[PDB]
Design a protein around this ligand. Structure first.
Ligand code: NA
Ligand code: NA
Ligand code: NA
Lengths: 285, 270
C-alpha cells in the first residue's frame, strides 16, 4: 500500500524537507512580485504628476486656482512614496529575512539538500533490519507457495503412472520418490515461513520505535518552518496595512488645505491687475 | 503698451473665455488619466492574485498554513476593488459633472464659442467711438508734426501761409485731444461694464473648479474608505488561523506514523 510503514515510503516525509526549500523560493517570489506592482503604481503616479505638472504650468490656468489643481499632483506624490516604502519594506524587511532563514537551514552538497539526504539516510538505517525480515518473509512466502504447487502436480503424475503399466520400475519409483520429497518440501517450507513471520512480528515494535524517532525529527523541523512562515505572513501584513501608514490622514488633510485656498477674488483681482481695468493708461496728450 | 486700455488689448480677457472651455477638457483628461492608473493597479493586483492562487494550490504548502498564504490574495483582491471604485467614481461621476457644466455654460455658433464672440462684440462696440477719436488725434498729430517739418526748411510766399499752417494744426491737434479727453469717462465706463461681465462669468468657472477639486478629493481620500480597516483584520484573522499543530497532525495521518499498516501475516496457498 501507500502506508508510511511500507519500505521506502518515508520518502513523502523527506520530500517535504525539500518542498520546504521550494516554498521559501515561492514566498520570496510572491512578495517580490507584489513589490513590483507597488513600484509600478508609484512609478505611474509620478510619471503622471510630472506630465500634468508641466501641462498645467504651461497652460492657461492661473492663481490660487492653478495652485489648487497642483494639489492633486502633490497628493499623488505623497501616495507614491507610501507605495515605494511598501516596496522597500517588502524587499528589505521581509524578503531578506526569508532569504536568510533559507540560507541557514538548507545546505547544498553533492547535488542534494543535505538536510534531506541525511534524513533519508537516517530512515534507511532505521528501516534496514526490518527490511531484511520483510525480505525473508517474502522468500519464505514464495518458496512455500512454489513447494505447494510442485507437490500438487507431483501427486498428479503419480496418478497416471500407477495407470501406465508399461513404465519401468525405476520410472514408477522416481515419481513415488518425488511426491514424498516434495511433501517434505511443503513442510520444511511451511515451517521457515511461520518462523519468518514470527521473527519479524517480534521486531515490529523496535521498528516502530525507530521510525517514530526519525519521523519526529522531521516533524520538529517542519514545525519550525510553519511557525516562521506564519510570522513572515504577519510581517507582510504589517507592510501592507494602510490603516497604519500614519501619514495618510495628513496627505488628505493637506490636500484639502490647498483646495480651500482656491480664492476666486484673489484670482480675479490679480487678473484685472495684469490684464484688465486696473492697469495704467496714459491718455493722449 | 500692453495695457488693456489701448485698442486691441481687451482680447486677452477674451482668449480667457475660450481658455476656460479648454481647461474643462484638460481637467477631464487629467482625471481620466488618474482613473486609468487606478485601474492599472487594480488590474495588476488581480492578475497577481490569480497567478499565485494557482501556484499555491499546486505547490506543496497544505493545511491552514496554506489558507494563510491565501490571505494576501484576498487582501489584494479587496484593494483592487477599492481602486476600481476610484476609477468609477472619478469617471462616471466627477467627469460627467464637468461635461455637464461645460455644456451648460458654453454654446457654439458654428465652430466658435458664442459667449466669447458675444463679449468680443460688446468690447469692440464700446471701444469703437473712442478708437475713432484716437484715430483723429493720430492724424492731427502727424499733420502738426509735418507742419513742423514744412516750416523748418522754410526758415517769400512759403513763409507766412505755413505760420498759418502751424496755427491751424496746433489748433486742431489741441481740440481732438480736448474731445477724446472728454470721452474718456464714457469709454472707461463701458469697457468697465463689459469687463465686469467677463469677470462674473470667469468667476463661475473658478468656483466650479473648486467644487470639482473637492470632489476629486473625496474620491481619492483613503481615510474615508469604510471597508479598509476591516480588510486588514479579515487578513490578519486568516493568518492567525495557521495552526501548525493541526497541519502536522494531518501529515502524520496521511503521510506518517499514524497511518494504518498491514503487518505480515501467514497467507495460505491458492
Ligand atoms: Na498656468
Ligand atoms: Na498546496
Ligand atoms: Na488559532
Amino acid at each position: 500500500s501507500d502506508s508510511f510503514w511500507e519500505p521506502g515510503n518515508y520518502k513523502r516525509t523527506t520530500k517535504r524537507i525539500e518542498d520546504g526549500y521550494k516554498l521559501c523560493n515561492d514566498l520570496q517570489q510572491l512578495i517580490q512580485e507584489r513589490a513590483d506592482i507597488e513600484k509600478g503604481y508609484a512609478k505611474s503616479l509620478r510619471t503622471w504628476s510630472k506630465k500634468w505638472g508641466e501641462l498645467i504650468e504651461k497652460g492657461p490656468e492661473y492663481g490660487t486656482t492653478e495652485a489648487a489643481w497642483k494639489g492633486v499632483l502633490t497628493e499623488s506624490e505623497r501616495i507614491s512614496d507610501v507605495h515605494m516604502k511598501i516596496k522597500d519594506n517588502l524587499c528589505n524587511d521581509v524578503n531578506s529575512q526569508i532569504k536568510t532563514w533559507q540560507k541557514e537551514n538548507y545546505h547544498h552538497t553533492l547535488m542534494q539538500i543535505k538536510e534531506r539526504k541525511d534524513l533519508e539516510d537516517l530512515f534507511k538505517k532505521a528501516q534496514k533490519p526490518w527490511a531484511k525480515l520483510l525480505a525473508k518473509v517474502e522468500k519464505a512466502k514464495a518458496d512455500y507457495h512454489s513447494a505447494c504447487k510442485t507437490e500438487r502436480s507431483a501427486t498428479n503424475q503419480e496418478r497416471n503412472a500407477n495407470a501406465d503399466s508399461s513404465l519401468s520400475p525405476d520410472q514408477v519409483k522416481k515419481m513415488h520418490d518425488r511426491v514424498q520429497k516434495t511433501k517434505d518440501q511443503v513442510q520444511k517450507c511451511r515451517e521457515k515461513y511461520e518462523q519468518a513471520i514470527a521473527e519479524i512480528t517480534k521486531y515490529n515494535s523496535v521498528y516502530i520505535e525507530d521510525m517514530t524517532s526519525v519521523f519526529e525529527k522531521c516533524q520538529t523541523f517542519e514545525k519550525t518552518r510553519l511557525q516562521f512562515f506564519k510570522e513572515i505572513l504577519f510581517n507582510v501584513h504589517s507592510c501592507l496595512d494602510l490603516t497604519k501608514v500614519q501619514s495618510l490622514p495628513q496627505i488628505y488633510e493637506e490636500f484639502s488645505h490647498t483646495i480651500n485656498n482656491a480664492d476666486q477674488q484673489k484670482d480675479l483681482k490679480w487678473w484685472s491687475n495684469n490684464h484688465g481695468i486696473n492697469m495704467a493708461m496714459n491718455w493722449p496728450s
